[PDB]
Amino acid sequence: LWVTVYYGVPVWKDAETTLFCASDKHNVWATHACVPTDQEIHLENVTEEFNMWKNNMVEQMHTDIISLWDQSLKPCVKLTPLCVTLQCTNVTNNDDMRGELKNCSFNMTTELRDKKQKVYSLFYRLDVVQINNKEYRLINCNTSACTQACPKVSFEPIPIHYCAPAGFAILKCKDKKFNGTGPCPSVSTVQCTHGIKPVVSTQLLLNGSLAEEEVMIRSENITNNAKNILVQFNTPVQINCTRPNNNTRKSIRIGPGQAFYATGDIIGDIRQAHCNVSKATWNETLGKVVKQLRKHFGNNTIIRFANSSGGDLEVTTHSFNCGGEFFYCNTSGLFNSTWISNDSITLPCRIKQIINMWQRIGQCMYAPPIQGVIRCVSNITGLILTRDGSTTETFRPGGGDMRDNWRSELYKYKVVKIEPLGVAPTRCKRR
Amino acid sequence: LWVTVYYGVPVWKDAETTLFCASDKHNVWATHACVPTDQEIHLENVTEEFNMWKNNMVEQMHTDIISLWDQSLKPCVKLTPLCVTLQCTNVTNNITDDMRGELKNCSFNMTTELRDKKQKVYSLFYRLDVVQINNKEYRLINCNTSACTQACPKVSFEPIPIHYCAPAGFAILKCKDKKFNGTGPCPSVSTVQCTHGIKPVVSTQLLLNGSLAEEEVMIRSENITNNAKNILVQFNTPVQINCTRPNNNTRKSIRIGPGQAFYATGDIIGDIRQAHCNVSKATWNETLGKVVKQLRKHFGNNTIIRFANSSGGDLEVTTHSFNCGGEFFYCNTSGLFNSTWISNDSITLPCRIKQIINMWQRIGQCMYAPPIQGVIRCVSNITGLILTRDGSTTETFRPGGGDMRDNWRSELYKYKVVKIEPLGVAPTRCKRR
Amino acid sequence: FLGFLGAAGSTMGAASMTLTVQARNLLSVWGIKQLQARVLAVERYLRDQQLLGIWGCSGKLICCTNVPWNSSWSNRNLSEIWDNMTWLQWDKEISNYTQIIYGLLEESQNQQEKNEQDLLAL
Amino acid sequence: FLGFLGAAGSTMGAASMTLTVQARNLLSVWGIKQLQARVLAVERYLRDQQLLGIWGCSGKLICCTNVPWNSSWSNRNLSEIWDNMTWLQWDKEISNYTQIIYGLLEESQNQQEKNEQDLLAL
Amino acid sequence: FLGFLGAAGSTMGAASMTLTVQARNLLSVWGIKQLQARVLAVERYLRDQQLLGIWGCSGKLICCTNVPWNSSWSNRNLSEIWDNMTWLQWDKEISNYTQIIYGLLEESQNQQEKNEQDLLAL
């Protein structure tokens, strides 16, 4: 027997690499930093071990979604002049949207440096902090200056495909019962992933991909209460947003070529912004979640859903973006139930204009007012739960870390490095 | 005899390339971007022609050190609102006679976190930082040339050793001769993966924290008979120098804008004492005796060797400018170079602190070094000199400096970058069939 | 035609029919991310071609060498390697014997390089 | 084993047994500068491998050719070249005759390409 | 000597004696432009070298292969191909069949790679 060298053997090792974007009005995650797309090959008898919790595509996608966010905010207005003293009065002076607003008057710079401009705007009470018609100031003014969300770029997520470079392959687990870890009997080599919409949300995985046959529970260590549980639905739960107000965006020229878009007036339906989830559909979806959740804790255990414990408004609420305006919904009527072995649910949502999105300090963003009435149709395709540390297990909604949102889309994918040079014995002998 | 082609022959030639960094809280000379290190092969029978004065590693390191400097001063505060009229009085509160009218207690109106509001703040400024305009009205010394970028408070100025490593297809040849004078054939050459840890210590008139000679004091000049060329001395034993800033400065944060803070000297807790450096008188006199001995080999045994203090010029070139602890000292070395040589006690060098620092000799680029809380003590190694000779049987040598490339020429003198030329053709009795 | 990595689960005998399928797929600040991935693929490919070249295997997908198969690496008979195992299983078994085999192939070629060079001068 | 460039001071005959050591090391503010150093290494390596292929020496470290040695290039005998000179000394001697030799090898193989093309036509 | 692309208007027979001229010219903000063009030149060169390798033509400029000419790709005889047409005129004629021939050359070599491999086992 003699050593014979084979070049091109189908052998791969696990690897971490830089996957390039691909996609098929400018966007935050635009197509100017991506590549046009064009595929899937079934690898029979191949049983690969996946790990959705130590996947580097999740860590890289988090970096890239952040990077495309900042890259889309540099070329537009920085609101340094908006740190002035505000003389704010109430809008209603008495349940409505107008009880959430302060009518703030301030001196603003003009396009001519030596001239001022007495203007006013309606600021949400969540954006103004009192100084001790009282005197207020914008909330993120002692920490940073808010680069205005540029009005011509949309926040709508477009699907992005992460494609492996040459010498690498993306392995896709086609198993329908694959939780997040261990062998996957059915594997495929895709050129690159399905369109992953970077939907940014907390406590609820809006839009995205459904499970195939049954609700899937995915935790790094189900016995550890410090680990989030990524529930994935099989049938989506439709959630409808609204801001009933007919907003009136107003433009203020704060400098040469720079405009500040302000809420000048609010008329129309002044009901508080809310989201509606069907009460029958949500009840049967939690029934499926509970059924798949007793498999890890016992048949006789009591599964109780409570509401978020505490913390920032971005972590205690179903924070999300819808129609360019950022909502923060309570979701305390969604998660309120105890499970023993036409109607709708209305979630009161607050709205903010000053956004510190990626759990960072020092880089805020001022989301300008959206003219008109905002309406919203989304699919709740998952959950992020945390368990409380007795025969009763309490599951509060979780979140905060944006990586668990994209870990729910990149759980089935894996990047490998092709090792095409292999040696093996054969009856050969070089002449 | 037929031509036979050999690939991979050990043949090289002189070449210039972009060596990449490697290194074994952030730093100015960022080691996070530098790749981690890992190496040395002795080359018997190899004699290589070195030249430390035409070495491109020095020119590349100067560009890299400057580039790593101003790229670390991009993200942090630009002190353009600090160009205002300061109404300064003198600190006379507990001042020693030496440090009399050297700190000025300057009050000024600063911008607040809120654009429309104003803020009346005071700070202590060194006399070297403020110039009077006609309590008296002063302004910062660099407000008619440029606005000054505050040195970022979390980045560190401490030199971290860096390794300049040649790319694939290049080699770094290291001269292992212990009496190499920087130029000429080096009979003991070795190939290294890349250079030793070269700390980018910025200094003047004294090479601090450098590498010591192996056998004796090494004198290296481009043309020893040319006075216009600087003379690089290298010590075989170090002369430790103890730095200090006795003042207990208090750092005060002034909120000058949204997300921006300016760090100002609050008040010294105690008596005002002058910063100084101590060099052992016995050790320094011993070392100069060794320096003179090898300095007579190029000027004669009967030549009178005289050491004088710096001829004149900028404060950065007339003083032992250096930095340690974050504060930038400008020490007066007229006590180190004062002697004439013919055929427990300590020397105290009165230093002066400065805060607006322009160090790469680039007019238009500042850096405001924020005050350092507490008391600064610092112990370095004087491992070399940068001397200059005056234009008779008496030679006068004065400390030199300014050009920062001489500080790094004293570390990269033994290294050389060559390009491997592996395609060689030689006659042989072969004949292709 | 199975496609790229299609024969990953096939036996070592059947997976060797399709070595050219994997061979051709090894070669082909946001610009730098794409650009640095392209350079990594090129130098990763060239290091494998260089290894084949110094073993006297350049330009061949299947190359026969003059290094006898030491049974210490694997004592399994030829019938239970090319018809029972897959290439992924094989790589895990001789993973620790890979580097010692690589040195032997390099030492076998330069021995043939000089022996043929000497014989060619006769 | 001497290491990379270990036989730089060794004789041409002795340094020709360590060609693999130098060959494998020719392929593999701190951003684009480090990236363009890798691309330069690949381009320098690829243009040297291209020359070998043009001369018919692809995939070989010692390539005996057909071009006779013009005595004008070097009148020394084999004994005092392969046992008394090092490769650095030898490169200095024929540094100016390198380009004329390169053209001779390039055309000689081009003649051999058409000579074997016509022989195969019969 | 004609130079780079100088024999573009020369007949196919005359232009095939100047392949080394074109072969050596395929390899050699505003910093990535220079750098990304260099990486693309290296990648394109390696793609064509890889194709020659999997056809058994590695290290050769003229490579006679075992694939027969179908005459459905071109019915012209050798006299009117190598003495009347140029390589640009010829390229526009078999552009449709280029990928058909490129597949036959790869398949023929793979079969020939094993027939020779099985021959050494005797």
Ligand SMILES: *[C@@H]1O[C@H](CO)[C@@H](O[C@@H]2O[C@H](CO)[C@@H](O[C@@H]3O[C@H](CO)[C@@H](O)[C@H](O)[C@@H]3O)[C@H](O)[C@H]2NC(C)=O)[C@H](O)[C@H]1NC(C)=O
């Ligand atoms: C020459 O090298 C010496 C040591 O090799 C340098 O002295 C060292 O400088 C660093 C940075 O200033 C000191 O670290 C600091 O220590 C203080 C007190 O422990 C601490 O509060 C700081 O946070 C920081 O960690 C280090 O202690 C000091 N070592 C001594 C004095 O023995 C010296 O600065 C160098 N001189 C140059 C580069 O000119």
Ligand SMILES: *[C@@H]1O[C@H](CO)[C@@H](O[C@@H]2O[C@H](CO)[C@@H](O)[C@H](O)[C@H]2NC(C)=O)[C@H](O)[C@H]1NC(C)=O
């Ligand atoms: C806008 O600026 C004007 C001045 O240009 C402010 O009016 C002054 O308010 C102060 C009290 O803080 C009075 O002492 C002055 O007499 C006022 N000047 C006038 C009326 O000409 C006004 O308050 C500012 N508006 C804001 C900050 O909303």
Ligand SMILES: *[C@@H]1O[C@H](CO)[C@@H](O[C@@H]2O[C@H](CO)[C@@H](O)[C@H](O)[C@H]2NC(C)=O)[C@H](O)[C@H]1NC(C)=O
């Ligand atoms: C910026 O100002 C806000 C508002 O004053 C600060 O947040 C407050 O911090 C105090 C002290 O812990 C709390 O009692 C308040 O409830 C906080 N207010 C809000 C709205 O959270 C914040 O700490 C300041 N940031 C900095 C860097 O000074």
Ligand SMILES: *[C@@H]1O[C@H](CO)[C@@H](O[C@@H]2O[C@H](CO)[C@@H](O)[C@H](O)[C@H]2NC(C)=O)[C@H](O)[C@H]1NC(C)=O
């Ligand atoms: C989830 O997906 C739906 C459907 O794409 C999104 O709703 C669309 O939003 C865009 C932009 O606001 C509108 O132009 C479409 O008309 C909407 N479609 C429907 C059916 O209403 C929704 O915004 C997504 N949810 C997010 C991003 O949180």
Ligand SMILES: *[C@@H]1O[C@H](CO)[C@@H](O[C@@H]2O[C@H](CO)[C@@H](O)[C@H](O)[C@H]2NC(C)=O)[C@H](O)[C@H]1NC(C)=O
């Ligand atoms: C979210 O919903 C909860 C529940 O409706 C609100 O908080 C509690 O409301 C019940 C009755 O509705 C009270 O008995 C509790 O005292 C409330 N707890 C509080 C106010 O801490 C809550 O106000 C809603 N909104 C938010 C932002 O939590």
Ligand SMILES: *[C@@H]1O[C@H](CO)[C@@H](O[C@@H]2O[C@H](CO)[C@@H](O)[C@H](O)[C@H]2NC(C)=O)[C@H](O)[C@H]1NC(C)=O
């Ligand atoms: C800081 O600002 C105050 C108020 O503007 C200055 O005090 C005034 O200075 C003007 C100068 O024209 C005098 O006419 C006033 O009499 C001063 N007092 C008041 C109450 O207005 C002060 O001089 C400024 N400080 C600095 C360092 O410029």
Ligand SMILES: *[C@@H]1O[C@H](CO)[C@@H](O[C@@H]2O[C@H](CO)[C@@H](O)[C@H](O)[C@H]2NC(C)=O)[C@H](O)[C@H]1NC(C)=O
């Ligand atoms: C910026 O201002 C400084 C301070 O006046 C200038 O430096 C002075 O130049 C005069 C010459 O007219 C000298 O007499 C002074 O001794 C200098 N001051 C110091 C502290 O040395 C400097 O020239 C000015 N620079 C520019 C570009 O205008």
Ligand SMILES: *[C@@H]1O[C@H](CO)[C@@H](O[C@@H]2O[C@H](CO)[C@@H](O)[C@H](O)[C@H]2NC(C)=O)[C@H](O)[C@H]1NC(C)=O
């Ligand atoms: C430098 O040396 C001086 C003395 O030349 C030191 O000052 C003395 O410090 C001691 C304490 O160790 C006191 O007892 C003496 O009274 C001091 N003498 C004078 C004249 O001040 C000084 O501390 C040294 N500085 C260092 C070592 O950094």
Ligand SMILES: *[C@@H]1O[C@H](CO)[C@@H](O[C@@H]2O[C@H](CO)[C@@H](O)[C@H](O)[C@H]2NC(C)=O)[C@H](O)[C@H]1NC(C)=O
């Ligand atoms: C170089 O040394 C000379 C002499 O030691 C310094 O000049 C004199 O120093 C004395 C010290 O007491 C002063 O009283 C004189 O006024 C100085 N003379 C002049 C003309 O200034 C000189 O200052 C030193 N220079 C440096 C850069 O150290």
Ligand SMILES: *[C@@H]1O[C@H](CO)[C@@H](O[C@@H]2O[C@H](CO)[C@@H](O)[C@H](O)[C@H]2NC(C)=O)[C@H](O)[C@H]1NC(C)=O
């Ligand atoms: C100053 O130089 C001395 C002498 O080189 C240094 O002390 C020696 O450092 C070497 C290198 O690590 C050690 O092997 C020796 O054991 C040290 N000797 C002693 C007596 O400690 C010293 O570290 C240098 N100081 C500074 C601050 O660079």
Ligand SMILES: *[C@@H]1O[C@H](CO)[C@@H](O)[C@H](O)[C@H]1NC(C)=O
């Ligand atoms: C403004 O509204 C707040 C909260 O709604 C209330 O506490 C305050 O009294 C109001 N100010 C008035 C009515 O002047």
Ligand SMILES: *[C@@H]1O[C@H](CO)[C@@H](O)[C@H](O)[C@H]1NC(C)=O
């Ligand atoms: C996920 O499934 C695999 C295979 O069934 C199993 O080994 C693993 O334990 C599961 N994950 C957890 C956290 O139990």
Ligand SMILES: *[C@@H]1O[C@H](CO)[C@@H](O)[C@H](O)[C@H]1NC(C)=O
């Ligand atoms: C939510 O339901 C309420 C009644 O329950 C209705 O008035 C409101 O219009 C609904 N909003 C949306 C967005 O469906």
Ligand SMILES: *[C@@H]1O[C@H](CO)[C@@H](O)[C@H](O)[C@H]1NC(C)=O
């Ligand atoms: C959401 O709105 C759609 C129409 O946009 C409607 O058909 C559906 O019934 C609504 N569902 C809920 C839960 O409000």
Ligand SMILES: *[C@@H]1O[C@H](CO)[C@@H](O)[C@H](O)[C@H]1NC(C)=O
């Ligand atoms: C959770 O609900 C309780 C009352 O049920 C409420 O006091 C608390 O504020 C809620 N926490 C949230 C919404 O984060």
Ligand SMILES: *[C@@H]1O[C@H](CO)[C@@H](O)[C@H](O)[C@H]1NC(C)=O
């Ligand atoms: C929700 O999902 C359904 C299919 O499950 C789809 O038809 C509908 O358009 C989705 N709604 C969205 C994305 O708003």
